[PDB]
Design a protein around this nucleic acid. Structure first.
Ligand SMILES: [Mg+2]
Ligand SMILES: [Mg+2]
Ligand SMILES: [Mg+2]
Ligand SMILES: [Mg+2]
Ligand SMILES: [Mg+2]
Ligand SMILES: [Mg+2]
Ligand SMILES: [Mg+2]
Ligand SMILES: [Mg+2]
Ligand SMILES: [Mg+2]
Ligand SMILES: [Mg+2]
Ligand SMILES: [Mg+2]
Ligand SMILES: [Mg+2]
Ligand SMILES: [Mg+2]
Ligand SMILES: [Mg+2]
Ligand SMILES: [Mg+2]
Ligand SMILES: [Mg+2]
Ligand SMILES: [Mg+2]
Ligand SMILES: [Mg+2]
Ligand SMILES: [Mg+2]
Ligand SMILES: [Mg+2]
Ligand SMILES: [Mg+2]
Ligand SMILES: [Mg+2]
Ligand SMILES: [Mg+2]
Ligand SMILES: [Mg+2]
Ligand SMILES: [Mg+2]
Ligand SMILES: [Mg+2]
Ligand SMILES: [Mg+2]
Ligand SMILES: [Mg+2]
Ligand SMILES: [Mg+2]
Ligand SMILES: [Mg+2]
Ligand SMILES: [Mg+2]
Ligand SMILES: [Mg+2]
Ligand SMILES: [Mg+2]
Ligand SMILES: [Mg+2]
Ligand SMILES: [Mg+2]
Ligand SMILES: [Mg+2]
Ligand SMILES: [Mg+2]
Ligand SMILES: [Mg+2]
Ligand SMILES: [Mg+2]
Ligand SMILES: [Mg+2]
Ligand SMILES: [Mg+2]
Ligand SMILES: [Mg+2]
Lengths: 95, 77, 190, 107, 140, 166, 148, 17, 97
RNA sequence: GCUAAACCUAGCCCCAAACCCACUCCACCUUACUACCACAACCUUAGCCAAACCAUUUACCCAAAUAAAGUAUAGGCGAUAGAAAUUGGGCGCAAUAGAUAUAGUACCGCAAGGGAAAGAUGAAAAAACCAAGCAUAAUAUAGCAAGGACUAACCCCUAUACCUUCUGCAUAAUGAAUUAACUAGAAAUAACUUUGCAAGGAGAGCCAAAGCUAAGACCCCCGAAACCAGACGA
RNA sequence: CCGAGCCUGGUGAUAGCUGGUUGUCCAAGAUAGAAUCUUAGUUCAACUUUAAAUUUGCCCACAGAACCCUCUAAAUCCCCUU
RNA sequence: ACUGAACUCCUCACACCCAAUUGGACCAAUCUAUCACCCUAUAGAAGAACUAAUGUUAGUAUAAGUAACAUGAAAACAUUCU
RNA sequence: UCUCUUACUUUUAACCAGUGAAAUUGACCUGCCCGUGAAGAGGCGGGCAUAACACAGCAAGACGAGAAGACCCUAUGGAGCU
């Protein structure tokens, strides 16, 4: 990715990242399952449900995603009626 | 020509040492050399040997006749 | 350091004159292979990693830190019997030797910093005296800084200036965070 | 290295221990400065230790010079006539004291 | 040329000082000198081990020499001296051999006596009156 | 360039006491920038190295080498000035104390080989130095006798110590 | 730098390249988590707790009406019009132990917070502010210097 | 399969005293 | 050889010339003077450098856009080339990604 | 004791300020520097390179610093590209350095074109020591050249040169005649560490569910065959 | 020095390939694998290091871990005590 | 029985024998601020350290006084001869 | 040409005199046999030999010197041709 822009000399975000992942303010990232729209006739219903769910990403994936994205995307946003509002903060977390 | 003073000064002191090796100066008595007081040295001569000398006598012991002849001749002019 | 700008630059390999062609073919001779005669390796070549252009070393400490700086410097002066308070910087005569011999008589020390409140309303007598004295220095209140105070052995202040310094430095704590630069009007600033 | 350097056989001056032990250190010459950090450690050595040290060994004559210098030093002279120069420089009172002891108990 | 080393002469002299007594170019040419001086310092380091080994070998030879001239083997002498609980190390025995030869003969004589008392004890089976010199002193 | 050798004739010693051996006279002389190889000059220098002046002039006369006439000139110049300026009584009683050749300053030209190849040729120059000492030449050290070998061998055996004891 | 390779010569591939196989980020399907993020409106929350504490310290004045401008001046809130903020949302939190009678002006309020204010005898109303009005109201003094 | 020769510049050889 | 053979002329530094004496005065222009001026208005020097700091690449970008029109043909070509170099260096090279 | 060594000042670099020279007599577009006789200029840059290939694609100066914002947006929707409204003199070099520069000269090339090196007394010239290499002064059994030693230089005993790439490597394989000078780790996010202030931090913008501000501390050198544009050559 | 002349410029072209990389001292410190136009290279994992928080880890005894194939060894997993 | 290690004991001392890598304690010289004033101190900075790139420049060696190179004869230096 | 080579002349050569290169070179105080290193030892192990120092020859060894590397493989290196 571009560490120093040629116009302004600041970092740039990889837009491939932004249209695939949701980052929560706490530091987690959310993705969809790969192939959730693919060939559903042959898949079993349990398999289908496992596909529909929005999952988290492990530490390294999360680290890589944060490097590929600017500080703007990491700020706290007070959207009106976002369905992900509750998930922004953690609860009862000791290490 | 290199900016700096320390390396240059060091080198001068090295050259001084080499010059001393080449032609050593004539030996001169320690009286004719810095950091000398004969009085204090006399007392220390007593104390080194753990001997309670009479300091007046010890002084008298160290003064040769050859010295006094030379001293008289020197003082004359 | 904040005011410092570096003027040193050196030419890189690309910026040195000539050095276009390959000096000799790679394979043929016994010689070590080269691409240009202006490479860092060569005599007369460009510099590998050198001073590059005008360089600025500008940064800002936070305001409250600089304020605290002034405070410490002033406490330290008074703690060590290096600080003196004066009704006015008014001199019986403009003869500069009078000021030197007074400092000698009062055990001020070799260097004295004289602070007045305003530049315009500084007395005639002190300005004449201090103009031709190297070690004694006259500044207005707004001039005062940590560096000069440390450089000079004595700090001399007036009663006008002491009230002024108190006001401004004490203002720094017990203020809000700004909404906009303080040069702009507020309901109670200036 | 042993080949690369000179050698001596073990000896003393004038069979030191035989009759009576004689302290070989004869003279000490301290060069200090009134101002300047190098001589700082040495300065307070002259504040305290010099006096009681000089009492402890009356055989040694101590000279303190107190002149401007970038490197303070000590010149140890011995009975036999050897001269040992040691640059005290930026050394704490304690490690200067250790030096002066080490000089005084050797030939 | 903002910064240039000004005192390389002194850095060079540090190696060359050691190299003075060598032969050939390596006594003065730095890129040669350094390599040999490194080897010299390593040699000198490992030579501590060998000094100690070799000194003992010299002592053992010297002791063997003096023992042989009274007409008993080295092992005989050294072993029997221990069973007499006279603990003198090789250094002093070798030193006695050269400088105090009367004392050395006495040591040799006592060793051979203990040797013989041992032989007598070996011959007998069961309980017999123990040799005078064979008797051991206990410490509690 | 250094020119120390020349200055050696400007040394003045203080007058001697009557109770002193008569100091031999002492002349230093040289020629600079001789077009001749320094090592080639060495052989001629080495030859005359300990002989008297006349005997050296004799040897140099019949010597076929180029530098031989050059050295002859230097020696005659040195002899002349010895008598004239250095207060030497007799011109015959001088011997060569030291005879040395140094490298003088050299130029570089080119030598053209085959293909395009070449080499750097050096126009060789050198200095010659001499020193003359007034008086008869030193008699050469006698060859080592069997008795001297024997004597020193005895000395050598007597120097042995019992090593690594007290 | 290690031993000589792509790493040591400093010619490592870009971030997110998996050496050949379809990289993690690419191989995931695209979904509109942030499809129209810049067009969404954002309201900064003011809690009743926050409001009460401001009144208790005399920072926000109850003898006068409250609007955006008064709160901002009080340092009760920070509003970034540029960052798609559209004013102040009034939240339920600390409904109990809210004892003050005020005329408050907010862009959004929850029914509970309305109830909380009207219980004490206060008046709450919601009023819309356009972005160009908002930047003006939040910081009036700079706007006054614009000469418009 | 041929390497041309190279001449050093003439100024070095033409140096005088 | 390459070491001096005499001591250079001693350098005397006048610590009490006017420039040394009034060094750093008015650095507190802001806090002591009602905030009329920032201290960064005491900075003199290049147009593109007064009260700003950046790496080489950033400095070049800035000089290009601020005094790019007014600078000499060959100087500007050198500057355009610098930027090309540094762009590749910083984006495509190094230890860490 | 030779060869040498040593030097401080010519000048130069980056800024700021300010809009620059176009020049006695004669000659000079013909074969320029030669007194003196019947055609005509404006026309998309490409390519290296990045994409770990390559084929669409890949920042390059356009007329206010900051912020909006690496946002909207664009894109084999991937590498990457990227708005607008709006806001407003010297901690420099000092003769292998610094300009190539004592000079675009000498020299090299048919031409376009390439392109050096170097100097040092003193107020006045109308006045001491240190690189390599050698010399002083060749050499005597035996062996990585030394170490342990020794009364003693050698003799005695112990001891498979260095760097780099390979699992070993003694040695195998690259590299070094030697001396002097020059010659190679440049930066972000995020963390940690130390301060100031603290539900707020910051000298507009930005962040904040103890955070925010400031500082500290992390990212090398030399080398192809090539490709393209414009000149020069029978 | 022509399977495509030479010069300047783009140009510090590019080089997963070769070569090099400059003071002292101390400390911790090695070989599960997977994908890859990939095996002369990267990325993930494993190991390694530093800092932090907190509680068990290693060695382990009983009990326990399959039939079929027509036949079964050194052993291994799990594991309180210590 | 003796000999036989850097193992172990003995008298003292103790951070002081792994590649890549990672952590740490110091520090040569130079410039700046302030000291100092026969060459230092505390800090701030930086073109900040070379036994090695068939590295680049200059000097001097090895091969090596080697390979190689050169003027027909006599004479009076008029001339003549081959 | 050879069986089967010989003799003489010139060039070279070797000596005296003048001028004076080049590749090469880690340092060298630079031996032989056997073993080891699987092949490959002047330098490692066991034996043997051995005052020092020029000049002339020879080509068995120094994996002898010098090159735009003959062959095989590799590069997500080029280029010409179809
Ligand atoms: Mg170029
Ligand atoms: Mg190139
Ligand atoms: Mg090349
Ligand atoms: Mg340059
Ligand atoms: Mg030709
Ligand atoms: Mg030559
Ligand atoms: Mg590379
Ligand atoms: Mg590509
Ligand atoms: Mg690449
Ligand atoms: Mg120059
Ligand atoms: Mg030049
Ligand atoms: Mg020398
Ligand atoms: Mg031997
Ligand atoms: Mg390799
Ligand atoms: Mg080999
Ligand atoms: Mg023709
Ligand atoms: Mg590869
Ligand atoms: Mg360790
Ligand atoms: Mg794979
Ligand atoms: Mg594939
Ligand atoms: Mg591959
Ligand atoms: Mg357990
Ligand atoms: Mg033992
Ligand atoms: Mg142990
Ligand atoms: Mg230990
Ligand atoms: Mg310092
Ligand atoms: Mg450097
Ligand atoms: Mg060097
Ligand atoms: Mg070669
Ligand atoms: Mg070579
Ligand atoms: Mg080199
Ligand atoms: Mg020769
Ligand atoms: Mg030969
Ligand atoms: Mg010949
Ligand atoms: Mg021959
Ligand atoms: Mg000849
Ligand atoms: Mg050659
Ligand atoms: Mg063999
Ligand atoms: Mg060999
Ligand atoms: Mg021969
Ligand atoms: Mg090849
Ligand atoms: Mg290809």
């Amino acid at each position: 990715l571009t560490y120093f822009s040629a116009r302004k000399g600041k970092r740039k975000t990889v837009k491939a990242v932004i249209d695939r992942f949701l980052r929560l303010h706490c530091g987690l990232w959310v993705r969809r399952k790969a192939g959730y729209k693919k060939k559903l006739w042959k898949k079993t219903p349990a398999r289908k449900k496992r596909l529909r769910e929005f999952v988290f990403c492990n530490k390294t994936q999360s680290k890589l995603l944060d490097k590929m994205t600017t500080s703007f995307w990491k700020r706290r946003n007070w959207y009106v009626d976002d369905p992900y509002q509750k998930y922004h903060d953690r609860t009862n977390l000791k290490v | 020509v290199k900016k700096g003073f320390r390396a240059a000064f060091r080198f001068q002191k090295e050259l001084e040492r080499q010059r001393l090796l080449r032609c050593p100066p004539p030996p001169v008595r320690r009286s004719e050399k810095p950091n000398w007081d004969y009085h204090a040295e006399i007392q220390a001569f007593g104390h080194r040997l753990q001997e309670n000398f009479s300091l007046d006598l010890l002084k008298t012991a160290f003064v040769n006749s050859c010295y006094i002849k030379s001293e008289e001749a020197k003082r004359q002019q | 350091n904040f005011k410092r700008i570096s003027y040193a630059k050196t030419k890189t390999r690309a910026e040195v004159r000539g050095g276009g062609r390959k000096p000799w073919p790679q394979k043929g001779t016994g010689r070590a292979r080269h691409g240009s005669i202006r490479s860092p390796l060569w005599r007369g070549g460009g510099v590998a990693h050198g001073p590059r252009g005008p360089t600025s070393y500008y940064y800002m400490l936070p305001m409250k830190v600089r304020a605290l700086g002034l405070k410490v410097a002033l406490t330290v002066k008074l703690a060590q019997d290096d600080l003196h308070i004066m009704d006015s910087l008014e001199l019986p005569t403009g003869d500069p030797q009078y000021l030197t011999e007074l400092a000698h008589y009062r055990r001020w020390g070799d260097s004295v910093l004289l602070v007045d409140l305003t530049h315009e309303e500084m007395p005639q007598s002190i300005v004449e005296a201090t103009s031709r004295l190297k070690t004694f220095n006259l500044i207005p209140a707004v001039g005062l800084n940590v560096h000069s105070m440390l450089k000079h052995q004595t700090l001399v202040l007036t009663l006008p200036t002491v009230a002024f310094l108190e006001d401004k430095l004490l203002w720094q704590d017990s203020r809000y965070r700004p909404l906009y630069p303080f040069s702009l009007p507020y309901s109670d600033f200036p | 290295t042993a080949r690369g350097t000179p050698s001596r056989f073990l000896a003393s001056v004038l069979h030191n221990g035989l009759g009576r032990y004689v302290q070989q250190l004869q003279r000490l010459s301290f060069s200090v400065s009134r101002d300047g950090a190098s001589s700082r450690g040495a300065r307070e050595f002259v504040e305290r230790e010099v006096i009681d040290f000089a009492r402890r060994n009356p055989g040694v004559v101590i000279y303190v010079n107190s002149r401007p210098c970038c490197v303070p030093r000590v010149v140890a002279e011995y009975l036999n006539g050897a001269v040992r120069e040691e640059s005290i420089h930026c050394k704490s009172v304690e490690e200067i004291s250790t030096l002066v002891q080490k000089l005084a108990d050797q030939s | 040329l903002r910064n240039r080393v000004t005192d390389r002469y002194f850095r060079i002299q540090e190696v060359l000082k050691h190299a003075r007594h060598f032969r050939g170019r390596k006594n003065r040419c730095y890129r040669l000198a350094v390599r040999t001086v490194i080897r010299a310092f390593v040699k000198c380091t490992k030579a501590r081990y060998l000094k100690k080994k070799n000194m003992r070998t010299l002592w053992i030879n010297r002791i063997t020499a003096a023992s042989q001239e009274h007409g008993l083997k080295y092992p005989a002498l050294i072993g029997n001296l221990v069973k007499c609980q006279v603990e003198l190390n090789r250094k002093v025995l070798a030193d006695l051999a050269i400088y105090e030869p009367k004392t050395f003969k006495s040591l040799a004589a006592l060793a051979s006596r203990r040797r013989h008392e041992g032989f007598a004890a070996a011959l007998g089976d069961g309980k017999e009156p123990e040799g005078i010199f064979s008797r051991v002193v206990q410490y509690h | 360039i250094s020119r120390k050798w020349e200055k050696k004739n400007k040394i003045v010693y203080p007058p001697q006491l009557p109770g002193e051996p008569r100091r031999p006279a002492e002349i230093y002389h040289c020629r600079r920038q001789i077009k001749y190889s320094k090592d080639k000059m060495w052989y001629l220098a080495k030859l005359i190295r300990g002989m008297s002046i006349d005997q050296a002039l004799a040897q140099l006369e019949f010597n076929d080498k180029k530098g031989a006439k050059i050295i002859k000139e230097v020696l005659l110049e040195a002899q002349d000035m010895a008598v004239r300026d250095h207060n030497v009584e007799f011109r015959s009683n001088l011997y060569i104390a030291e005879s040395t050749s140094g490298r003088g300053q050299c130029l570089k030209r080119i030598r053209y080989h085959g293909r395009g190849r070449f080499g750097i040729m050096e126009k060789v120059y050198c200095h010659y130095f001499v020193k003359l000492v007034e008086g008869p030449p030193p008699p050469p050290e006698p060859p080592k006798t069997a008795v001297a070998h024997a004597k020193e061998y005895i000395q050598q055996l007597r120097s042995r110590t019992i090593v690594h004891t007290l | 730098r290690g031993h000589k390779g792509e790493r040591q010569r400093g010619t490592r591939p870009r971030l997110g390249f998996e050496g050949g196989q379809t990289p993690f980020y690419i191989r995931i399907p695209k979904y509109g988590f942030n499809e129209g993020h810049s067009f969404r409106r954002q309201y900064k929350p003011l809690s009743l707790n926050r409001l009460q504490y401001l009144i208790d310290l005399g920072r926000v004045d109850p003898s006068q009406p409250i609007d955006l401008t008064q709160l901002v001046n009080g340092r009760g809130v920070t509003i970034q019009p540029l960052k798609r903020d559209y004013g102040v949302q009034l939240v339920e939190e600390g409904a109990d132990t809210f004892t003050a009678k005020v005329n408050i002006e907010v862009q959004l309020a929850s029914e509970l917070a309305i109830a909380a204010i009207e219980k004490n005898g206060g008046v709450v109303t919601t009023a819309f502010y356009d972005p160009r009005s908002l930047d003006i109201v939040c910081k009036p003094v700079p706007f006054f210097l614009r000469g418009q | 399969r041929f390497t041309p020769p190279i001449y050093q510049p003439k100024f070095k050889t033409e140096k005088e005293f | 050889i390459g070491i001096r053979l005499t001591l250079p002329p001693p350098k005397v530094v006048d610590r009490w010339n006017e420039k040394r004496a009034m060094f750093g005065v008015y650095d507190n222009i802001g806090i002591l003077g009602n905030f009329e001026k920032h201290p960064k208005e005491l900075i003199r020097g290049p147009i593109w450098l007064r009260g700003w700091k950046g790496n080489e690449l950033q400095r070049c970008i800035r000089k290009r856009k601020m005094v790019g029109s007014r600078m000499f043909a060959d100087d500007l070509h050198n500057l355009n080339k610098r930027i090309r170099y540094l762009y590749k260096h910083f984006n495509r090279h190094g230890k860490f990604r």
